[PDB]
Amino acid sequence: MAKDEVKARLAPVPVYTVANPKNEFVLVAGENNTQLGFFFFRKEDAEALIEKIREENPRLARDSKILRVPMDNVYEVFTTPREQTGLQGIHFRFMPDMKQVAHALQLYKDAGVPTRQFIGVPVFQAEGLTVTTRDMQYVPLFLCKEDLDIAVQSAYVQRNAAQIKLYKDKADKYQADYDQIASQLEAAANGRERGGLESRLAKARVKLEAARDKVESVERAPLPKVEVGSFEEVVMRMTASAGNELAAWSQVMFVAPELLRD
Amino acid sequence: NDLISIKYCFNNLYNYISNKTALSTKNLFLFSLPYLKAISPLYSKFMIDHSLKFITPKTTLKLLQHKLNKSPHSNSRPLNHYNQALKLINGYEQYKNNQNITKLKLNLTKTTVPFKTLIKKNGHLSVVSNANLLTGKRLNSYLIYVNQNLKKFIQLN
Amino acid sequence: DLSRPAESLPARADEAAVQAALADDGGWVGTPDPSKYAAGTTQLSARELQEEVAKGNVMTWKDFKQQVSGLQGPEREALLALVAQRVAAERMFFTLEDGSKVSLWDLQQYVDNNPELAALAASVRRIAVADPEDPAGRPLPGGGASGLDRSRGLTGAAHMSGQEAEELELDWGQVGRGALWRRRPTRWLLGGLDGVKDWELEAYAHEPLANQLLGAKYGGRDPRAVVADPAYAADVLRAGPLLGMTFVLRAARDLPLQEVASSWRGLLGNYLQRQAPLSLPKAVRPAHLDPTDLNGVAWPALLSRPAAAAHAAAEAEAAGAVPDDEMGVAWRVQSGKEAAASVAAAQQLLQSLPDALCPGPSPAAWPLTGTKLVDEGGRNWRRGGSVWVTLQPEGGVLVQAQTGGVVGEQESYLLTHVQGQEALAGAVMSAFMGPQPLDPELAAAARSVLLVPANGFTAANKERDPNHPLYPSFTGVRPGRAPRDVAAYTLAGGRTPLLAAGGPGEAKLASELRTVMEAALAAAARAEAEALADAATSPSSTSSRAAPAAALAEAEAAEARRARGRAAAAAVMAEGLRRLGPDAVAMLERTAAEAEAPQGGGAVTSSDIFSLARTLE
Amino acid sequence: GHVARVRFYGPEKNKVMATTRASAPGGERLCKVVLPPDPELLDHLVSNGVVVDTGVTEDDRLRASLLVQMLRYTVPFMVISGLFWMIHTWILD
Amino acid sequence: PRYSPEALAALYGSSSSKGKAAAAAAAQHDTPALRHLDVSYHGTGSAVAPGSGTA
Amino acid sequence: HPWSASVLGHPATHPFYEDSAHNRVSMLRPNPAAPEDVTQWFCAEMPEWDMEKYRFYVDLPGDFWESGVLQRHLAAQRAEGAVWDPASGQYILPYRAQKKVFQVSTEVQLLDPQESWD
Amino acid sequence: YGEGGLRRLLALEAVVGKAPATTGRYRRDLELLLAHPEL
Amino acid sequence: XXXXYXXXXXXXXXXXXXXXXXXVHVFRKXXXXXXX
Amino acid sequence: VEAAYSAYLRRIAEAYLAEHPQMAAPEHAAHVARVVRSRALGTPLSFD
């Protein structure tokens, strides 16, 4: 998949950083000529960073302005020669909030392998969940487990209600069913037909009982499996796709953070 | 101004190969317009053999793989048989060398190719409220009417 | 129509046996009486040839010797044309798809005999074909647009809708455009009208071979780092004429032949003087012709001889030389001599330019008059005239011309085909792309765009590869805008492919697929050991002889063991990925596909998974 | 394949001038055609090797047409006056 | 009219000919339009005669 | 006129084309597929400059071009021509591409409003 | 689209083809023109 | 590329070594720099 | 349709082989058939 596709697909999700009045990024100096860029999914993180700047530099703390851009042009600049703009140790990194990475790691270790370290930026998805359009059913990607499960609860309620009224549909069909079975179980002379038709009744109602078992066990089945991944990896996979994974990635797109809530 | 495009091309190529090697290492650890044209002044097979006459291929690469993979009555018009005949004659004359001037029988195909391509895969419903029957000279009307009626009557039998 | 074929007759006699007739004596030409000896007579002993040479049936071979020696003029012509069309009729044939033999003379006559089929071909009228199905003779939906047919009436080139040009084998992608200026244009003076351009030149090079040679050595690195060192520069300089590189330069204005001719002499003089001995490869295979098969070429056999052509090619180059580097060329820069004699012959060939271009004072006998590449006045060359140059490996030069305009009536011309002239070939290649080229911009651009396909792709991307760096293809899906209101988030769907990053479930499914991996590859290894015991414990009745054949049997017995292991591994692959599900096959396809080298058959552990991905076939 | 060129002329480009090849009945002629609204003609024209030519089509339309329409309205008066002036003064001066 | 897919299978898969005929004759349908729309056409009659005095 | 349409030797057409023995010529062909009915036979059409013709008037509706009747007719009559038969290896003019009795080929001609010079 | 789809989906028109029905009123006459060549 | 995180005040490591002390602690093992 | 079409080619075949009795020999089982196939569709078109 060419880079223009991902530049169009990653646009809805923003990210906050800080620039100068000269429209220049702020960085953190270290040892032996190192600097690095940052991108905070919640602007309060950069605001706290420059509140720490005010702790040691009042000039730079007055010289700040808060910028909000999508991942569009930062991914663009990732796909560029970094030494064209000047690079001898400037490593742009991301900085996710600790809330969602903690939810991510609890997801991680409620699977069976308990660790306390993470790679990338935490993305969430749900099994069975896919937003359908007038034409196709695209997959929405949630950086926020809250928004994820707010969509998932609506979808779960509507589907399990569809299932309860589906079993009411089969309740209609089966009140009609026992009607014929009862209409000759003892209404005529018994023998062949009584045996055959009450074996038919056993058939029908043992099947419909296992059916309702399935229907409500679907609700007694757990929350559809929620998965967490790294934004770094899903993006570098989106970029280097061709063939089957092409049609796979071509229908996944990312929702805005804290959009589904309010 | 082709080098601008090819600078962007080098950007894309370096990023592509770097990310490919990166994800190769990654998933292994997880487990364990300037250039839009084409020509053919000589049949591909002929000069391919003439060149490979000097090269020892340790392994075949992707483009030649595609070529040898594509190597293996709806066209029975006499024009098409004449076409294939001239094809073979011109190939023979092409590789026979190895007015005082010869002009070919066919033309060389200088070709452009499209860019920004995709994946390989009555009546009317007007109605009046109430018809106005024409109510609100006529002797001739009645006359011609019954006259035609009795004419038909006599012409029945 | 065509299809006048022949039977399986012995004509190509495998020259190792023909030298027996080269050292033959007592032969003859003719055919004796049929009433005494049977038809098929090449036999003549002493007695019977003696008697028939006293009778008047057959003359001896040295008889024919001094008869040809004595034959002068008209009957010399008679027997010349006789033996000519005879040998054209019963000795040199082409091949159909059925593999039979259509000869030279019958094909010649079939082509230039029917003028009615030529009249059919000259016009455009396309005629549907009745169905050989008898009921109604309804014409089939064949029809056809044939983008080469849709392109007549145009002026510049022929738009081709991609794939059609690919199936036509136009394997020379454009590489660089430049301009020969009488005086380059100035930004400062008014409008740059001072700019006067001599010619408009473009270059092309074989893309499959450009991937084959240069892609195996300079591929897989940083493109900037690969072009940055002068080793690649000498590579593209010396390996140029091997690719059959083409230079197509067109006339942009009015050109008198004397002017541009003296210009070309002064232009190629300095490149003739200032160049060193040439650097040439070594000819590994003779490539004899097979006259009886006059359209068969061996490179498919050369790449697919045992399906293990690496080892046979290695033991074949053992005779000639071992290559000097990665791609497979054994360079040989010629010594002191052969470096000036060839240059002197090249200077001579250029000394024939004012004579061949301008022979005598009468244009009526000049070779340019009488055709639209030059004006009817005989002293100007028309705008839109194009010159094509190609360079064979062994110093051979190909040169053609083409007057442009209406594609429906374009006239192509072949000028000359000289051979052995390595000096002019080197001069052309190192003048267009050398250290001091006519315009370093096109040299740089062409070198970088010759780098770009060495990664595997092709400029003017005729495969619709979505990861093409210069001309990428897009997908028909539209970027979906996830809605705010939860009304289209159905979840009523049963399945959609897993596309997460490194997570808690995908590590697990990959490790269980890895369990299946080790089971499968161990099954493959034990199947190979089984085939080893099979090949060993069987009593092969073989007389130890022809060590190359024995080495081939070694290599392909190993190959058979490998193939049986591959089949076993594919079987247990289907087993495991049937047991677990399609998510495993999808992620394995992803990792294998990326693990394959972008510029090789199979290359840059990963070898195991991509071989087993080949077992996915 | 007996026409070489067609050139769409007119202010609305519905007439075309057609050039007949030497392979046509009667040699070379220039023939004008008024065409119906047929949405299949352009393909039939190109796919048989015909050189199609189109005008410059003067995008403005109510600025391209204003002065020529003024002339269409004013010139008849000049023609009538010139004709009558010729007869009634250029003879009996 | 909307047909049930069973009628389609009956007219499609049955290798018989008059079997397909009886399938197409015994097929039913439903028209959701009878649950959402009722359309009526009217002409807004006039109040002036086309030849009267007030005309 | 129906008798001036085909080249039947009806004794109502002026004797344009005659034999030596002065009998008009006719070009019938008995339709081997559907015999016994003369009106389904094949016959050549007469040169347009030799037909006697009625010239009828007609008002076209205001949606004649966007209904596609003339386009349907043009496409139906111009989409049939010669063929190559590979079963019998020869060129062939099919029967559905020939004119039955009393049928002609339509010639549509449009006039130019600017060619009036009022 | 349309009506009666189920019933919608239930000779030598592929060679000579259709028979023209506007000109039967001349059939008879043609027959006579064949029975008397002298006309 | 990627960055390692440890939810402990969570520590961070780049492939200098940011420390997200619950504020922040920009460790080095001084944000006086800007783009150019 | 089978019987009608078969009888059509039959009739035209009778007509032809009765018109020219010389090639009515079995030697032409592929020749008179080649003519019937050409005559059942329309008229044989000469190149000119």
Ligand SMILES: CC[C@H](CC[C@@H](C)[C@H]1CC[C@H]2[C@@H]3CC=C4C[C@@H](O)CC[C@]4(C)[C@H]3CC[C@]12C)C(C)C
């Ligand atoms: C396109 C440049 C052009 C100059 C003409 C060049 C292309 C020269 C090089 C090859 C020559 C032919 C080779 C020898 C033969 C045979 C000889 O006997 C008679 C002359 C003839 C045809 C030569 C004819 C002239 C040829 C094409 C102008 C535009 C500067």
Ligand SMILES: CC[C@H](CC[C@@H](C)[C@H]1CC[C@H]2[C@@H]3CC=C4C[C@@H](O)CC[C@]4(C)[C@H]3CC[C@]12C)C(C)C
């Ligand atoms: C600096 C020249 C550059 C293009 C290269 C052309 C002009 C060179 C390449 C091959 C040459 C010919 C090889 C054999 C022939 C045949 C012989 O008869 C006389 C000499 C002649 C023409 C040779 C001389 C002319 C040819 C075409 C331009 C673009 C500046």
